């Protein structure tokens, strides 16, 4: 059972840090904001950028 | 003890994927950006949208 | 072996909720959007805010 403990310790070594990308998050946020902007423009007729 | 591993491997099947909704994230980001914009506008008097 | 169960239960008590800051996310998103805007402005010569 000692090697089970050794493997569990080695598996506890792993850093609990999960790097998450920022460029894709920004692009998705921009797309959703654009959807909201288009909705608001449509509800205002055409008195906006387009 | 076999059914211990039965449940352990059955619940290992769990997908390590947590889907997070983009709409709420975008709305929160927009609100925080609006707070920052209001702060900046206040610091420059009223030389902005309002 | 009872205290094994006691400690594991006490540690299962933990809330599986991890709050993540929103101001930092908003600032990162704003910086990335600024980078994209600067890229688009450069590709369009200078026909933008600067």
């Amino acid at each position: 059972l000692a090697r089970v403990e050794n493997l569990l310790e080695r598996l506890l070594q792993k850093n609990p840090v999960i790097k998450m990308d920022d460029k894709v998050v920004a692009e998705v946020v921009s797309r959703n904001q654009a959807n909201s902007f288009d909705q608001y423009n449509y509800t205002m007729g055409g008195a906006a950028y387009s | 003890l076999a059914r211990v591993e039965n449940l352990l491997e059955r619940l290992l099947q769990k997908n390590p994927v947590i889907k997070m909704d983009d709409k709420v994230v975008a709305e929160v980001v927009s609100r925080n950006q609006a707070n920052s914009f209001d702060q900046y506008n206040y610091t420059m008097g009223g030389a902005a949208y309002s | 072996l009872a205290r094994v169960e006691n400690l594991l239960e006490r540690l299962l008590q933990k809330n599986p909720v991890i709050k993540m800051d929103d101001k930092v996310v908003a600032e990162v998103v704003s910086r990335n959007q600024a980078n994209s805007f600067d890229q688009y402005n450069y590709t369009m010569g200078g026909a933008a805010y600067s």
Partner: protein, 126 residues
């Protein structure tokens, strides 16, 4: 209340007024190149010379700093410019740069390390 500590040049302005206090303070900061710091309700306006004070405290790598970031942009790196002055009365009757009594092309020395990077012409009619 306001206090001034430093030397500032003269700036010519048009129809000064019709603004709130903060707008005029920002105009002063932008034009005269002053730095504003407030002791509660008393605004001190320094210049670059009297604002910064030298100190023996220092930033050292691996000692008291963790993350250092430098953002460098060269989208507006320009080493040449053409500018026009006021407009002559016989602007229609004249052709080319003769329309202005003041036409000048300025080239920065940094061109020697960056080449000719000329920007869009800016016009001042005063």
């Amino acid at each position: 209340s306001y206090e001034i500590q430093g030397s500032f040049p003269l700036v010519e302005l048009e129809d000064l007024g019709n603004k709130n206090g903060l707008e005029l303070v920002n105009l002063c900061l932008e034009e005269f190149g002053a730095i504003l710091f407030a002791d509660n309700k008393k605004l001190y306006f320094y210049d670059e010379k009297s604002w910064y004070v030298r100190t023996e405290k220092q930033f050292r790598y691996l000692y008291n700093t963790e993350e250092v970031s430098v953002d460098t942009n060269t989208d507006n790196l320009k080493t040449e410019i053409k500018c026009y002055g006021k407009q002559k009365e016989n602007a229609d009757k004249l052709t080319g740069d003769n329309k202005y009594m003041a036409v000048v092309t300025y080239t920065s020395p940094n061109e020697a390390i960056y080449g000719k990077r000329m920007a869009n012409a800016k016009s001042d009619d005063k």
